[PDB]
Symmetry: D2
Subunit: 405 residues, 4 copies
């Protein structure tokens, strides 16, 4: 009954630490006991003292977001804004430990606001899963590909795929062959969820159905890296993954001068030679921007997104052009083809992250139009990336990078 | 003064919300006031109710880690281990909201442990900065490239570069031309720091010195994306950035079967067709792995690293093959050429993150040998990625991916 | 001559003045020789008894002669129950010998099988609208079945063979890149497709008068530059071929073992290409085969850039897993049997050796499709032989013998 | 054995004649051979160096573009092609450059490479080998073994990368006037044999492990260079852009940025930041006995354009090609017609006084000609003249 007694009972080599909660009836106590057990295995027993753990809702975490829990990690949250986007104003929450990130993003928002605001559009929406399957011969895999490309073959596959969820709907298939191997990229809507588990479940049922028509087919892995999830890949850049978005703004010369502390000409010379030529010299696929990843990461951590998806979600091409009467105003656009995001599921099930989603008006399911909350969040991310690009690029043009962060 | 009064003064004097801490005495109250000012601008005024802010040390955060602070975001931290690596045992902290991640990584550690442990080696260590400068003509930039390629030219540059720090020591230069533009990749050690600020500071000094020899040289940007920082780039994959690490282990056939629920043969087939052929089909540069990004991200967030660096720090090639007298055992290796990490600076200045660094035995500076703590952390990251790769690949091979996520995610 | 040098007349306009193609070439050679450091240089560059009338207006300008490229033959290549004698134009010693060796291994193994997976040449122009919100509108428009229909009608009206199949539209702010993919009969199709694109864009401009057409090619095709889009989406013909080589053949013909071949294939064509940061280059030397057949058959040799895209795979097969299974997948073979260099006689001769010259009157596209299958199958033969030489340590030795 | 005909018979020509007769019987259309030329060609120089099982030769039309005014010299550039408009377009670009006062170029680097794959029992062992290779002493003994195989192959550096227990070693070496693949391969084989003496547990898997990288697109070639890395530039007068190129400097720049930078980025290109460098490279290569299959990496190029002059009306242009694989001795350059084209450029054979200078000069000509090609095509694209020019010169 006491923690000490429980620690002894467990230590009889009888019970693994990860099973503590399913033994006691209070999540926090399981965490407390795991911490005690862990302490005696550390070269510095008192190192956990500064890792917080009390008064946190572990009931929402267990069975959904983390195992073998020992506490939580507080990440400072700052706010940038208002971000004037599509005739609305957003106060953007950003979780980071990088000094100057929030300040810089706030400054970009200020330049956009004084510039009359930004406009964005969602160009596409579809999470993907790319399993790898194999047939006895390439002649066979070629036949399966041809079958999948017929309207009836696709129809059969879509029915099986769509049956696994209320929101997952198969839009298309991109099939690629490597000898007897066949990589099938399933692309589907997923309501307001980022959709990975949903799409994977749909894929699983669709492959089972395909097997009925081709019993010789061997499913090697539900993910054959053709999705592509959490690894850099030209396929995400070119075909899109999740939400594809574009945003733009014109910053008046006076604003570029007073808020950004530079000139339109200087910003354009840096953008072309850094974000286009520089990224090209570095052999980048999708990295034609200054720091989209910083903004994507901060918003993702703050809003319960999958931070590991910053790998592909940060894909962005930032463009700048002289505009206006005397070509002294700055036109800027950011195009992000693969923002993997959601307002339902995963980390968005937790209360603090729901608070940040509420701050933006996109928490949970959009009752009146499924998928609209996720689309709106993707639009906010793209616009905030643009605000960040504006400020960092201005700092680089003026020579202010080092002097601040 | 009261909260209402402080607010009225703010609005009235049109005062920046970000300057509140310089106005009030206590940091927490400034955050409270900021939250109050913000609540009035929200469509849902009660939004901040469940966003915590009390009892946190904001003094360490201000002027170093975040601005316009409205609270903190708690990320669950779990533990995977022991990770048996280089004759040592590590208890690895992982901050995540992805169910199954800690369980899977823990399973991989268990497999590695029953197999006698993993071995790792740091192959290179050097953070980089790649500014872009321009000359009047390409014939001029070609001259500058030649000059930087001389032992004497490199000497003068190294001298200026190193003068900015007790730890930043320039190791080499990689210079490339694009017409009249010249991209110079400075590569330098940085003690136990990730080094981005340190290196940028040294680069700025070296460029000023370069300018004394070539006054017609225009310095366009201290970062010309040739570093490359926080964007996918072949240069990081091929030349490395930060720490280049390799690790390996052999998992006995019995362990692959009982712990991983599959076979060495199935593991190899999935690895080759997914991590090699699959990534090739997808057009990946550096993504020849299953989920290195998951492990990298979780450890980074737990240990005060820069999570946005997951972009390049996640580069990894995971390889598997048959081993042992009967070729029944599973040999696995993970090679990560660009792990950007540090144990001093940035978020590692915060106490909770120092707690996770302390669990690993790598918090702060290694006074006896600057850089040893950061190197050790890089080894732990590579070994943990390897544990994670082992478990996910096994789940993919056995058809357990979706099922496991239905239970824990 | 004194005339030309006086009036400063350009050498390229010589054929107009003269009434003989060959005499125009002769006089151009004389003018050129005077300007050279060594005037006797042109002596060994042949020009006589060649039909310049076929070249003029179709294949080359300011002509001074022709360059003979040695042509060798490899085969029989036993593919899809047919046997081919493949002509290869090259100056690289060992290439024909090695390819011939691969054909022999394939033949003793019972032959190769191939399939054409897709067929569509592309053109990717770049256009721009005043704003990104405007370009997004055009992209949505092109994605409606009605929008696509009007664009297709305009495109297809420029030709009896070019038939638009699909569009892939992508945005970069206010810029819009539109990848037109179209069948092209037996032609490689670049001119046909560019013509169709030009007409299609004019039609789109009727609907969006604020649209500026920047360039008929905005590099989103992509033609003659390495690009992930060709590797991923295909371009021209996507083909796959395979074969199983008996263990005994691998030892006797290839001088190696199935295990050694597999180990080299995985660590070189997969792991090494990944270490090198390759997109589409998961093979040993597909480019050598493609180039040699292309030059021999009047193809556009500059398209070796993307046509060479290939992933070569190897695995153990058979009763005791001692036989060698091999497959080569080429998603972007840009090829044709009508148009361009295929209008010339010697190159038509090489196409005729393969039985694919000119138009397949009863089913346009069949001759080009067959040629694409032969290319893929020949690449596979070449892949087998070079990989065996690499596994056994024979590369440098063979080149000292046949390539020096 | 048909390929041994020349061994038994007298004349090379008769052997080709007989092989052709043998082949005839295997063709479904034997009369096709009637239009494949074979008579009166120097087969002696071909056998043992450039081709096997020879049945004749393929004539490729050769046109000339120029003069190309480059580095205070003038070159008449030979181009073998069947693409109508190519020579005309390249000639126009040359004309524009000449009227602009000529182009200037620089060779930035020179080193052919070979990237074998070897393997050790463990990654810990491969890590040790990598570290040894990174010492001046390790490099020194490897260079000694490598260099002993040639009078021209001189090892310059090594780039070693591992993937677990596998080790990829990129050897970079000078090669006199030769493109150097054979020379570098021979040096690599000896250097690996020596490395094995230091590390007996090392398995040499393949002399080429695709880390070179030869004839496959690869970021390593783009970033580190291969063969010759060259840059070229010129300024075209406003009146010339208008009169010769039929366009404006502003239109040129706009097309260049949006096609060659943005468009190539959209397509996911690594090294393809140009309009048609591959066309020029391929035509010169075929005419000059180069290895046309190397157009894969030799074509790598970034083309840049900016405004110049008092009112920004002149056009500045530069082309940067980091991986031109080329040579003036060896391979196809052993044949007479291709030697005639190399002689046209003044770079045929060995530069006896300074080995390496003829190949370096040829690489500069290639970069300069690509730049002339880029200028003309970009102008045609900006002006809307592409399709029209090809209907005129590239269609029977
Ligand atoms: C730090 C930085 C924002 C200061 O900008 P500045 O123009 O020199 O300083 P200013 O006092 O003139 O303020 C300009 C704007 O910056 C923003 N800003 C400045 N300091 C800020 C802070 N401490 N907190 C929040 N927002 C801040 C404000 O939105 C805006 O002023 P206003 O809304 O009160 O009218 C700028 O130097 C910068 O962004 N550099 C770092 C850029 C970067 O992105 N670094 C790499 C990624 S972290
Ligand atoms: C969830 C999962 C770990 C369960 O594995 P399993 O082998 O079927 O279950 P077992 O009960 O036999 O446990 C095997 C091992 O897993 C680990 N493990 C299992 N459940 C665990 C949990 N809830 N918490 C922590 N560790 C756990 C243990 O190290 C070890 O058990 P042990 O106490 O005997 O040493 C497995 O399905 C998995 O890893 N799936 C892949 C998830 C994944 O990697 N997704 C990728 C994105 S994170
Ligand atoms: C030169 C090479 C073909 C000789 O192969 P080999 O097996 O050692 O020699 P063999 O005498 O046993 O002949 C085996 C087969 O090779 C082929 N072959 C060999 N020499 C040949 C030649 N001179 N001409 C044409 N075909 C030849 C034949 O198809 C076949 O012999 P066969 O008449 O009995 O049917 C081989 O060493 C090789 O392929 N190496 C170079 C590989 C390569 O691809 N080079 C790099 C890219 S070009
Ligand atoms: C065909 C093309 C060269 C005609 O150019 P143009 O400017 O309209 O025609 P012009 O009569 O005004 O001649 C202009 C210049 O072009 C060159 N030129 C034109 N026709 C030529 C021909 N038939 N042969 C050789 N050179 C020619 C000349 O060098 C130069 O004039 P000059 O030397 O007599 O003083 C041009 O339309 C073009 O280059 N388009 C094709 C572009 C291309 O690169 N094709 C794609 C891949 S090959
Ligand atoms: N295993 C993997 O492949 C993988 C890969 C990367 C990340 N992840 C992890 O997966 C998690 C997110 O997965 P997920 O996005 O699919 O969440 P999920 O929690 O697995 O699925 C969403 C659930 O919410 C329900 N739902 C209700 N209203 C909805 C609405 N409006 N829109 C959408 N869904 C609604 C859905 O119903 P239905 O049951 O009817 O669909 C479904 O059960 C994260 O933790 C991430 O880290 C997993
Ligand atoms: N601006 C950018 O370009 C950029 C880009 C990406 C990330 N970042 C951010 O940069 C931050 C990290 O920068 P940083 O890694 O350079 O840390 P840093 O805090 O800026 O620099 C390290 C400091 O610690 C001192 N130090 C003491 N003992 C040391 C030891 N053993 N090893 C190393 N340094 C020691 C150094 O001395 P000296 O003064 O003598 O050097 C130096 O002052 C993160 O928050 C990250 O998010 C910045
Ligand atoms: N400018 C560019 O865009 C570009 C780019 C790369 C290469 N090229 C060059 O383009 C040339 C090849 O162009 P192309 O392939 O479009 O050839 P093409 O010669 O321009 O067009 C083929 C012509 O043959 C006719 N034709 C008759 N029977 C046919 C059949 N069965 N199949 C197809 N066409 C048939 C076509 O009819 P219709 O008139 O009814 O269509 C058309 O007039 C090469 O020389 C290449 O180097 C050009
Ligand atoms: N097998 C492969 O790895 C491979 C790959 C791609 C292409 N290739 C083929 O390789 C062939 C060319 O190979 P290579 O370039 O190495 O030529 P090479 O003909 O194999 O070697 C050049 C020979 O010329 C001698 N030489 C005399 N004067 C020279 C000078 N000034 N500069 C350089 N060498 C001089 C060299 O002397 P030393 O004996 O003292 O060195 C050597 O014997 C082409 O046909 C190409 O298609 C082969
Ligand atoms: C400045 C940068 O490193 C990002 C950062 O400071 O966090 C990105 C770049 O512009 O290269
Ligand atoms: C399973 C995976 O999606 C990662 C995850 O679940 O978080 C990665 C993959 O194998 O593609
Ligand atoms: C051997 C090779 O260089 C091609 C050749 O010899 O022409 C290709 C390779 O395997 O890297
Ligand atoms: C015009 C082009 O296709 C090349 C050619 O016509 O041969 C290249 C381009 O995309 O600009």
């Amino acid at each position: 009954l006491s923690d000490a007694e429980i620690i002894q009972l467990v230590n009889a080599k009888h019970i693994p630490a990860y099973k503590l909660e399913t033994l006691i009836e209070t999540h926090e106590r399981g965490v407390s006991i795991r911490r005690q057990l862990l302490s005696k295995k550390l070269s510095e027993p008192s190192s956990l003292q500064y890792l917080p753990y009390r008064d946190y809702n572990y009931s929402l975490v267990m069975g959904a977001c983390c195992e073998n829990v020992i506490g939580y990690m507080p990440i400072p949250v700052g706010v940038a804004g208002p971000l004037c986007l599509d005739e609305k104003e957003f106060q953007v929450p950003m979780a980071t430990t990088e000094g100057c990130l929030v300040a810089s993003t706030n400054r970009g928002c200020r330049a956009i606001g004084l510039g009359g605001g930004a406009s964005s559009r969602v160009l596409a929406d579809g999470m993907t899963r790319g399993p790898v399957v194999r047939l006895p011969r390439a002649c066979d895999s070629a036949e399966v590909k041809a079958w999948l490309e017929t309207s009836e073959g696709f129809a059969v596959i879509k029915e099986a795929f769509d049956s696994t969820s209320r929101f997952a709907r198969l839009q298309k298939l991109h099939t690629s062959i490597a000898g007897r191997n066949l990589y099938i990229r399933f692309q589907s809507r997923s309501g307001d969820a980022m959709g990975m588990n949903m799409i994977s479940k749909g894929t699983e049922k669709a492959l089972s159905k395909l097997h009925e028509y081709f019993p010789e087919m061997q499913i090697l892995a539900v993910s054959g890296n053709y999705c592509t999830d959490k690894k850099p890949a030209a396929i995400n850049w070119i075909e899109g993954r999740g939400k594809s978005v574009v945003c733009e703004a014109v910053i008046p010369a006076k604003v570029v001068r007073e808020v950004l502390k530079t000139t339109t000409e200087a910003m354009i010379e840096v953008n072309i030679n850094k974000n286009l030529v520089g990224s090209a010299m570095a052999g980048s696929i999708g990295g034609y921007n200054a720091h989209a990843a910083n903004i994507v990461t901060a918003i993702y951590i703050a809003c319960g997104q999958d931070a590991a998806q910053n790998v592909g979600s940060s894909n962005c091409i930032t463009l700048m052009e002289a505009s206006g009467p005397t070509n002294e105003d700055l036109y800027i656009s950011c195009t992000m083809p693969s923002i993997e995001i959601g307002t339902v599921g995963g980390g968005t099930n937790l209360l603090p992250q729901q608070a940040c989603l509420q701050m933006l008006g996109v928490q949970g399911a959009c009752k009146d139009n499924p998928g609209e909350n996720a689309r709106q969040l993707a639009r906010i991310v793209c616009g905030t990336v643009m605000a960040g690009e504006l400020s960092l690029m201005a700092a680089l043009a003026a020579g202010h990078l080092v002097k601040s962060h």
